[PDB]
Amino acid sequence: EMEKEFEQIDKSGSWAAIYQDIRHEASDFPCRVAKLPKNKNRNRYRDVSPFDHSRIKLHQEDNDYINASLIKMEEAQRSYILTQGPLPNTCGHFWEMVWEQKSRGVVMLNRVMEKGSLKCAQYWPQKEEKEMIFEDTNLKLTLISEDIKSYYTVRQLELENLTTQETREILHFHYTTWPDFGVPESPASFLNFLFKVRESGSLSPEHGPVVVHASAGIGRSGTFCLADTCLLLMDKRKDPSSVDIKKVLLEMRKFRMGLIQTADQLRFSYLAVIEGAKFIMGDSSVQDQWKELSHED
């Protein structure tokens, strides 16, 4: 059981050892297409590459590469696309992927500039009168509206294919206070955000997989996806306590390398699932408590 395990590891002070065991047991698959010379400028980091078997392929005959992976969680019946923060030359590819994969939501867990360094490109328009045209892929992106909160921002974007004139509404969920290789302020602030993404309809199987990213799209992204998947599993299993977080993370790591980058991010995933379990059990009032403790207003 996860709660008794959490307390046992917290008392022993063995979080570093538990996380190092997951890293040792983690899958190792080829990333041949990612390491190809022509794809060097399409990768933000040399040590973060998608596996060939799970990589997302663009529908262009020229070069189908994008540093993105499809996490297919079979039992939980949910899929996520984890990608890197797009580079100045891959912003068109990013939106081409969103279009082709029919994604309705994009979850951003980082900031454009963290500690005076560019971690992600400004891939979306900041002003509504200033739309962005990606000439390479023939796509137009316009900011419709934005709801700014204390630690997160929800944006309504319009994505248009200029060849067909087809229009789609994309929701952009931006967590603005999650530092690199860090954890959120509290389980309440994380869960309030996760449930806002859930209630929007962006995670529905009627749409394509949600795009989740950070700078590399492995650390903060892995924490978000692990918490979401573990909460989904304890709803349909009829035995909530049968969910093993470490096993779910190893299953996720079969699709993209290095999901969850620190021992504290793993510990936080436990805290997030234990606190989130209260809502899944039937107590509706805990969602209202998360809204108060998150300090969104």
């Binding site: 933000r44 980091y45 040399r46 040590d47 973060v48 590399a216 492995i218 290095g258």
Partner: peptide, 6 residues
């Protein structure tokens, strides 16, 4: 930097 894994 061109590395993420520290």
């Amino acid at each position: 930097e061109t590395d993420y894994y520290r």
